[PDB]
Design an enzyme around this catalytic site. Structure first.
Site, PDB file in Angstrom:
ATOM      1  N   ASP A  61      20.236  10.791  16.391  1.00  0.00           N
ATOM      2  CA  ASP A  61      19.821  11.198  15.330  1.00  0.00           C
ATOM      3  C   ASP A  61      18.434  11.452  15.208  1.00  0.00           C
ATOM      4  O   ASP A  61      18.001  12.421  14.429  1.00  0.00           O
ATOM      5  CB  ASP A  61      20.357  10.700  13.894  1.00  0.00           C
ATOM      6  CG  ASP A  61      21.963  10.603  13.907  1.00  0.00           C
ATOM      7  OD1 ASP A  61      22.482  11.989  14.365  1.00  0.00           O
ATOM      8  OD2 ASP A  61      22.581   9.874  13.435  1.00  0.00           O
ATOM      9  N   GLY A  62      17.414  10.667  15.475  1.00  0.00           N
ATOM     10  CA  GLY A  62      16.183  10.834  15.629  1.00  0.00           C
ATOM     11  C   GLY A  62      15.677  12.192  16.502  1.00  0.00           C
ATOM     12  O   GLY A  62      14.920  12.864  16.003  1.00  0.00           O
TER      13      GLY A  62
HETATM   14  C1  LIG Z   1      14.525   6.375  12.560  1.00  0.00           C
HETATM   15  S1  LIG Z   1      15.150   8.100  12.200  1.00  0.00           S
HETATM   16  C2  LIG Z   1      14.157   8.171  10.857  1.00  0.00           C
HETATM   17  C3  LIG Z   1      15.360   7.755   9.625  1.00  0.00           C
HETATM   18  O1  LIG Z   1      15.427   6.456   9.716  1.00  0.00           O
HETATM   19  C4  LIG Z   1      15.950   6.075   8.122  1.00  0.00           C
HETATM   20  N1  LIG Z   1      15.354   4.738   7.714  1.00  0.00           N
HETATM   21  C5  LIG Z   1      14.172   4.498   7.841  1.00  0.00           C
HETATM   22  N2  LIG Z   1      13.775   3.321   7.099  1.00  0.00           N
HETATM   23  C6  LIG Z   1      15.185   2.859   7.095  1.00  0.00           C
HETATM   24  C7  LIG Z   1      15.634   1.703   6.279  1.00  0.00           C
HETATM   25  N3  LIG Z   1      14.930   0.783   6.028  1.00  0.00           N
HETATM   26  N4  LIG Z   1      17.101   1.529   6.390  1.00  0.00           N
HETATM   27  C8  LIG Z   1      17.676   2.584   6.870  1.00  0.00           C
HETATM   28  N5  LIG Z   1      17.496   3.758   7.439  1.00  0.00           N
HETATM   29  C9  LIG Z   1      15.932   3.829   7.398  1.00  0.00           C
HETATM   30  C10 LIG Z   1      15.604   7.397   7.271  1.00  0.00           C
HETATM   31  O2  LIG Z   1      16.564   8.102   6.903  1.00  0.00           O
HETATM   32  C11 LIG Z   1      14.750   8.392   8.269  1.00  0.00           C
HETATM   33  O3  LIG Z   1      14.769   9.538   8.164  1.00  0.00           O
HETATM   34  N1  LIG Z   2      21.431  10.703   8.714  1.00  0.00           N
HETATM   35  C1  LIG Z   2      21.770   9.804   8.883  1.00  0.00           C
HETATM   36  N2  LIG Z   2      22.670   8.712   8.377  1.00  0.00           N
HETATM   37  C2  LIG Z   2      22.946   7.710   9.110  1.00  0.00           C
HETATM   38  N3  LIG Z   2      21.833   7.077   9.784  1.00  0.00           N
HETATM   39  C3  LIG Z   2      20.900   7.777  10.484  1.00  0.00           C
HETATM   40  C4  LIG Z   2      20.765   9.270   9.789  1.00  0.00           C
HETATM   41  N4  LIG Z   2      19.875   9.661  10.277  1.00  0.00           N
HETATM   42  C5  LIG Z   2      19.273   8.916  11.050  1.00  0.00           C
HETATM   43  N5  LIG Z   2      19.947   7.858  11.195  1.00  0.00           N
HETATM   44  C6  LIG Z   2      19.849   6.371  11.863  1.00  0.00           C
HETATM   45  C7  LIG Z   2      19.187   5.370  11.143  1.00  0.00           C
HETATM   46  C8  LIG Z   2      18.721   4.085  11.749  1.00  0.00           C
HETATM   47  C9  LIG Z   2      17.744   4.721  12.813  1.00  0.00           C
HETATM   48  C10 LIG Z   2      18.416   5.603  13.710  1.00  0.00           C
HETATM   49  O1  LIG Z   2      18.687   6.600  13.045  1.00  0.00           O
END
Ligand SMILES: CSC[C@H]1O[C@@H](n2cnc3c(N)ncnc32)[C@H](O)[C@@H]1O
Ligand SMILES: Nc1ncnc2c1ncn2[C@@H]1CCCCO1
Ligand SMILES: CSC[C@H]1O[C@@H](n2cnc3c(N)ncnc32)[C@H](O)[C@@H]1O
Ligand SMILES: CSC[C@H]1O[C@@H](n2cnc3c(N)ncnc32)[C@H](O)[C@@H]1O
Ligand SMILES: CSC[C@H]1O[C@@H](n2cnc3c(N)ncnc32)[C@H](O)[C@@H]1O
Ligand SMILES: Nc1ncnc2c1ncn2[C@@H]1CCCCO1
Ligand SMILES: Nc1ncnc2c1ncn2[C@@H]1CCCCO1
Ligand SMILES: Nc1ncnc2c1ncn2[C@@H]1CCCCO1
Lengths: 261, 261, 261, 261
Positions: free
Chosen positions: D45-46
């Protein structure tokens, strides 16, 4: 010594029970379910809770052991494959004991009844709205309106208390923890929200505001109480004793149950 | 005895400080901010935290007092109108003392630094993702991914710990409480979620997984630590001592701050 | 038009009701509690819920109004001092209408019953443990074990839903929200934990695992249902209509109830 | 059509990318990373979030696809074994499209900058305390003191929003959700606590009380903003378009990620 074995009642637990009785017969051990000194529970934590409550008048003279025939329990924390080694070491009887705190509930009417909980005692209303005044050491603390309240022992914190957002506390801490069930909060009713952790000798009292009928639970037992004037919680002076035959730390037991095993 | 008075620095607190110094001059009391035995803090809980940390090397020889010139604090819990009665009773010096537990944080590099917290110590990441391994008494407990972690003293539980969903614990309990900040939980990462309450002599260790730079806070002080190998938490053997001049119970103080006053 | 006025039944509400009837007599308005087109509720939100359910078969032909004689309600959101201005503007009848979504609950046996909720519908067990399978649009989503479940309308989100940690949603959103009551979570049982928000035409089905007796509530009404095969939730095609006589925005109403007024 | 493929950059994703390019060469498809109409993301997703933000100026003319080479993602929700079938069906180009809502963030200084978020936008303080006034449609709603605030899209609700206790909402709902990070609540500061769900055309404004420097994040991008006068949130008029090549329902995707797969 004198011992007894309670069973969950399925084939697996009954057969393990019969085999442990046979193994015990090879030692100077007598089966006695009236005055046992060792109470072995075979099943789950629910089976263990019934064993504790079956013998809660002789807590000072009993060491408890739990065997889980299903998934790991917090009281039934030994596997059936260790039952033979358990029989051996219980027979010699140089094992050590660890003690967990218990919760004393007092229910007053307009008369008195007291109960010991190993997990928790909870209060809910008998159909209608639940409103009680919460008094801490004779100090009025809050007027609670919601679904109910839960007072947990330390080893109870992994159970109902956990589902209500309470903290897990190591059972070497002599304390009790009060958690809320679905509290109403606005600019009329106001509760603390947070779980509250109380030490020994602190007394939490619940007092009716209008309706005086409550559904009170103590571990697995839930009964409707009528004409209730007060519910009092405090850490019991009594403790449950476990036979200790290995190192299985509480936090590892938490890890194995909730994180991974 | 020797005493000193710290002030928040606004007109109200400075003038109360000057008046208490004048009142103390009528007794056998010496102003000494190097080796005081009584440290009076005038302002809020933040002023009190700076007073504690100003003198944390002489904790065994100091009784602390807090006066709140704003709203009631949990450490600054005496009103300015009582300052004259405070001077009187501090001068005679037959008051009693109550002690609260403290949190010891150890930070190891690749070298070592130790810190005492009166409220809490928190760990967050320096920009990037926060991943640490949580080790409890040398037992790997969980791999935490999220915003960070907070370890609170008992009297700290009403502060940051409360905002994170932790329990409020009576400060007569020698313990520390670990709460999570925004933990990621799915079928890849897995944390306990619940606050965890640890007794004395238990050691919680945080160990880096990838990045080794963390923003570590101790009470009001937050600094970036680099090349961190381990962060260790345990209940301190040291305690903060308060001068006790009246009965103001902790649970009433909780009530007055969060429920109603 | 034809109108009726329901009253909480205390002196304050009955006297306001009699005075509004007198005021209405000065206009071309007929009192009719069989086929009213305007239903005025005097009391609290609870009085308003009974008014809604008294006339839920003629929702398409009724505009509702609530007057709070106690504290501000979310449906009873007009003060008694505005009752005279209310009579005037209701009589002319060029006011506008706003519509809120409703929740349709279907209960199937082994036969069928349907219910409309304005706040929420909740499911709990009849004494024993509560286990249901949660099916979303014919997809098995989770096996829930705990105290129960709550499905809220948008305007219901400030009520029970809020106490369970659900989100507050603006009632212009056609949706329903499912919240958990005290879910068990370990490595055996597993629920989503988070509140779930569902759009129109999505169907959430609750299916028994073992016991088939449940205590089902719809707004204030709670009754034991036996031999239940399925409970189905969906956003109703029906809507409740309010007479709009001023601007009182939902978020301001949230502010006045929970933040400050 | 014109297409491009972005890769996480490890061996697995680069090799899958090269193989899909080879497969596309057998069709009337041109590789173009300037004006693509199909953007395929290979990684997690990143990786998908960077693809979205790489092309957020041509959202109306692009259909996005994500392939997860690690665990199932919410945007990268197709397995590498389907890449050949993906190339085939993307080449013919009679697939359908589904659209998700986006969040528009506006940052005003004393000048203006706007940003689109696919997951969320968060606001925290630059070291010191975080205090902002929360204004909803020009109505002052609350004064927030705490760690910060998070505004999530519907598809963002499974991400940071979920870790903060927010609700999961089906992405067919045109809304945004505001969640709190560690709010201070006593009888001085007061916040709503609950997540708030806002429809289209509602405007949430954050206004500084004292310090005007904030750390603002939009999806993966976090930058320090100085001299900030206002942060405005609203549902964007723009939408992200996905190529739809199978039925993978959102709630099943939630189930597979958080419950079991
Ligand atoms: C790693 S991809 C970036 C996404 O990680 C998610 N993220 C960042 N910090 C946290 C956290 N503490 N818990 C859950 N998801 C997070 C956010 O939704 C961001 O858009
Ligand atoms: N929309 C999303 N729903 C759930 N998870 C997501 C989403 N976008 C990014 N992540 C994850 C969060 C944990 C680190 C890897 O990426
Ligand atoms: C089934 S054995 C009885 C125990 O189940 C636990 N329990 C009951 N209801 C719940 C619930 N909703 N969530 C978690 N544990 C529960 C209580 O701790 C009780 O002592
Ligand atoms: C202002 S004095 C410093 C104290 O503020 C408390 N604090 C900091 N951030 C927060 C927060 N987000 N919520 C509640 N208390 C906080 C911490 O306990 C710290 O020791
Ligand atoms: C008293 S009017 C009936 C309404 O009270 C609300 N309610 C019931 N129990 C609770 C609770 N524990 N917390 C908050 N609201 C509740 C439900 O939304 C119901 O529709
Ligand atoms: N002390 C306990 N800690 C954790 N779990 C417990 C405990 N006691 C009983 N259980 C479980 C609860 C779920 C139903 C089976 O029994
Ligand atoms: N121990 C404490 N319990 C409760 N509140 C505390 C504590 N210490 C400091 N504060 C407050 C936090 C909000 C900002 C002002 O200082
Ligand atoms: N829709 C509602 N939003 C908020 N509060 C509500 C609602 N309906 C009824 N109440 C209250 C709940 C507490 C007891 C009095 O009635």
């Amino acid at each position: 010594m004198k011992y007894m074995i309670t069973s969950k009642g399925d084939e697996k637990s009954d057969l393990l029970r019969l085999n442990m009785i046979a193994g015990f017969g090879e030692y100077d051990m007598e089966y006695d379910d009236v005055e046992p000194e060792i109470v072995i529970s075979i099943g789950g934590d629910g089976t263990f809770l019934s064993a504790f409550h079956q013998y809660e008048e002789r807590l000072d003279e009993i060491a408890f052991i739990g065997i889980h025939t299903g998934h790991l329990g917090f009281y039934a924390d030994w596997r059936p494959a260790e039952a033979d080694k358990l029989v051996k070491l219980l027979a010699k009887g140089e094992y050590q004991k660890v003690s967990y705190p218990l919760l004393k509930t007092t229910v007053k009417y307009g008369k008195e009844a007291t109960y010991l909980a190993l997990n928790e005692s909870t209060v809910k209303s008998s159909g209608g709205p639940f409103v009680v005044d919460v008094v801490i050491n004779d100090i009025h603390f809050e007027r609670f309106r919601g679904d109910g309240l839960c007072m947990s022992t330390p080893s109870g914190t992994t159970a109902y208390n956990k589902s209500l957002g309470g903290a897990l506390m190591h059972p070497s801490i002599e304390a009790m923890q009060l958690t809320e069930m679905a509290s109403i909060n606005n600019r009329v009713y106001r509760t603390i929200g947070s779980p509250l952790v109380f030490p020994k000798h602190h007394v939490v009292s619940l007092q009716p505001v209008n309706d005086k009928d409550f559904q009170i639970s103590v571990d697995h037992l839930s009964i409707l109480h009528r004409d209730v004037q007060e519910i009092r919680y405090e850490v019991s002076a009594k403790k449950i004793h476990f036979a200790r035959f290995r190192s299985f730390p509480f936090w590892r037991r938490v890890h194995d149950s909730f994180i991974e095993d």
